[PDB]
Design a protein around this ligand. Structure first.
Ligand code: G1I
Length: 284
C-alpha cells in the first residue's frame, strides 16, 4: 500500500538526518577549537568518523533497497556495501571498548595515567583498531570466503538483483566473536572496577564528613549498548546453528535496531560543559 511506503520513508530519512547532524557537530567542535584537543577526545573523533560513514553509506542504500524491494545497482557494488557495514560496525564497537579501557587506566592508577597515555600512543591504538576492523570486513568477504553452499544461496548469488546476506557457519561465529563478545567481556570487567572504586571513595568520604550518580551514569553507558546490539548478535549465531528457526524479517529488524545506536553516541559521550559551550558558540 502507498501508506506504508510513504510512512516508512519519513522515518528512514529522519534517522539519516539525525545521525549526520549529530556526528558532524562533534567533529567540527573538536577540530575548530584548541580547548577540546585532549588525548581522550581522539577516540571520540574516531567514533564520530565511523558513525558518519555509517550514516552516509550504510543506511540510505539499505533503505532504498528495502523500499524498492530490488537492488537495482550492480552485483559488484553491493559486496562493497556489505564490507562497509561490517567494517563500520566493528570499528564502532572496538572504539567504545578502547574508551572504556582508557577510562579504567585513569582511576586505578592515577599516578601513571599521564606517563602511559601519550598523543603518540593514541595514534597507534586507533590505527591498530581500524586495521583489525579492516581485516575482518574486506579481506574475508571480497575474497569470496564467506559464501554458503546451499541451493538458495547460489541461486541468489547468480542474479544481479540479489544481495541478501548468506553466510557460512565459521565466518558467522568468528565475526561475531571478534566484533561483540570479547569487547563485551572486556567492558564488563573494566566497568565493574570503576564502580567499586567509586563506592570505596564515597565510603571513605562519608566517614570523615559525617551513590545514585554512579548507577545512573553506568546505566546510561551500558543499557544503550547491551540493549541495541545484544539482541542481534544472539540471533546472528542462532540462525546458522539450527536450520531456519529465525525468520529473515526478524533478522532484518534486529539489524536495523542496531544502526540506531550510531545516533545516540554524541548524547551519551558529549555532555560535558566544555562540549556544551563549544556547541553553543558554533550555532546561534
Ligand atoms: C549486512 N549486515 C551485516 C551482516 C553481518 C554482520 C553485521 C555486523 C557485524 C558482524 O560481525 C556481522 O557478521 C551486519 O551489519
Amino acid at each position: 500500500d502507498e501508506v506504508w511506503v510513504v510512512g516508512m520513508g519519513i522515518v528512514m530519512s529522519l534517522i539519516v538526518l539525525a545521525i549526520v547532524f549529530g556526528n558532524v557537530l562533534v567533529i567540527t567542535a573538536i577540530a575548530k577549537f584548541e580547548r577540546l584537543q585532549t588525548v581522550t577526545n581522539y577516540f571520540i573523533t574516531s567514533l564520530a568518523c565511523a558513525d558518519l560513514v555509517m550514516g552516509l553509506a550504510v543506511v540510505p542504500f539499505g533503505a532504498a533497497h528495502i523500499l524498492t524491494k530490488t537492488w537495482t545497482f550492480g552485483n559488484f557494488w553491493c559486496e562493497f556495501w556489505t564490507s562497509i557495514d561490517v567494517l563500520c560496525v566493528t570499528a564502532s564497537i572496538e572504539t567504545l571498548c578502547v574508551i572504556a579501557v582508557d577510562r579504567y587506566f585513569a582511576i586505578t592508577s592515577p599516578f601513571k595515567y599521564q606517563s602511559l597515555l601519550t598523543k603518540n600512543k593514541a595514534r597507534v591504538i586507533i590505527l591498530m583498531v581500524w586495521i583489525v576492523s579492516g581485516l575482518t570486513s574486506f579481506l574475508p568477504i571480497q575474497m569470496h570466503w564467506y559464501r554458503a553452499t546451499h541451493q538458495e544461496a547460489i541461486n541468489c548469488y547468480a542474479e544481479e538483483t540479489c544481495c541478501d546476506f548468506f553466510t557460512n557457519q565459521a565466518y558467522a561465529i568468528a565475526s561475531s566473536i571478534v566484533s561483540f563478545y570479547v569487547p563485551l567481556v572486556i567492558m564488563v570487567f573494566v566497568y565493574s572496577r570503576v564502580f567499586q572504586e567509586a563506592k570505596r571513595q564515597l565510603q571513605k568520604i562519608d566517614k570523615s564528613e559525617g551513590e545514585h550518580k554512579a548507577l545512573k551514569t553506568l546505566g546510561i553507558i551500558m543499557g544503550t549498548f547491551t540493549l541495541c546490539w545484544l539482541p542481534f548478535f544472539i540471533v546472528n549465531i542462532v540462525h546458522v546453528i539450527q536450520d531456519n528457526l529465525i525468520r529473515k524479517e526478524v533478522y532484518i529488524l534486529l539489524n536495523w535496531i542496531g544502526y540506531v545506536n550510531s545516533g545516540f553516541n554524541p548524547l551519551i559521550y558529549c555532555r560535558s560543559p566544555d562540549f556544551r559551550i563549544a556547541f553553543q558558540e558554533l550555532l546561534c
